[PDB]
Amino acid sequence: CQEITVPLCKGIGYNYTYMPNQFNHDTQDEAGLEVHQFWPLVEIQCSPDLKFFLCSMYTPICLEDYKKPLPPCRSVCERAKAGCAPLMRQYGFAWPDRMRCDRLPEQGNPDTLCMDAA
């Protein structure tokens, strides 16, 4: 584990993330340069979940008791896509293929453990 240094992801729920991430990034700074390109959509608040979602992917949680990766649930992603994609579509921006939601576990499985709302 190391501590979150990227601005957009500070105080989202946890202060500790690991590297490399699901996107295969060396430093948080390298990861930050890319997630910062979403800064508009965060301010627009097209989805409340987007900041949490983008941060669970670019700086996934790191726990000292649970050493298996912990991704966001499919439902969390499907809501951020629901809010953001139309607006992004309007400006010629496709919903990123890494952000795809079927690549994520659905909630309600002991085998597929994830992060979501009830």
Ligand X SMILES: *[C@@H]1O[C@H](CO)[C@@H](O[C@@H]2O[C@H](CO)[C@@H](O)[C@H](O)[C@H]2NC(C)=O)[C@H](O)[C@H]1NC(C)=O
Q: Report the interface residues with ligand X, using CB under 6 A.
A: 14-15
From the list ligand X, ligand PAM, another protein, none, partner contacted by residue 3 (C-beta under 5 to 8 A by kind): none
Among positions 74-93, residues that touch another protein (CB under 8 A) are 93
What is the residue whose two structure tokens read 């949680």?
61
Residue 90 near which of another protein, ligand X, ligand PAM, none (CB within 5-8 Å, type-dependent): none
| Contact flag: residue 86 with ligand PAM (CB under 6 A) | no
The identity of residue 98, as a single letter, is R
**From candidates 43, 90, 108, 110, binder to another protein by CB under 8 A:** 110
Query: Burial letters for 48-82: b for 16+ Cβ neighbours within 10 Å, e otherwise?
Result: ebbbbbbbbbbbbbbeeeeeeeebbbbbbbebbbe
Which residues fall in the annotated binding site for hexadecanoate? 37-44
Angstrom distances, CA of residue 117 to CA of 13, 63, 91, 93, 107: 13, 19, 30, 28, 9
Using the 8-state DSSP alphabet, how is residue 64 labeled? S
Look at residue 42 and give the partner it binds from ligand X, ligand PAM, another protein, none, a contact being a CB closer than 5 to 8 Å depending on partner kind.
Answer: none
Residues lying near ligand PAM in the complex (CB under 6 A) are found at 37-38, 40-41, 44, 88, 91, 93, 96
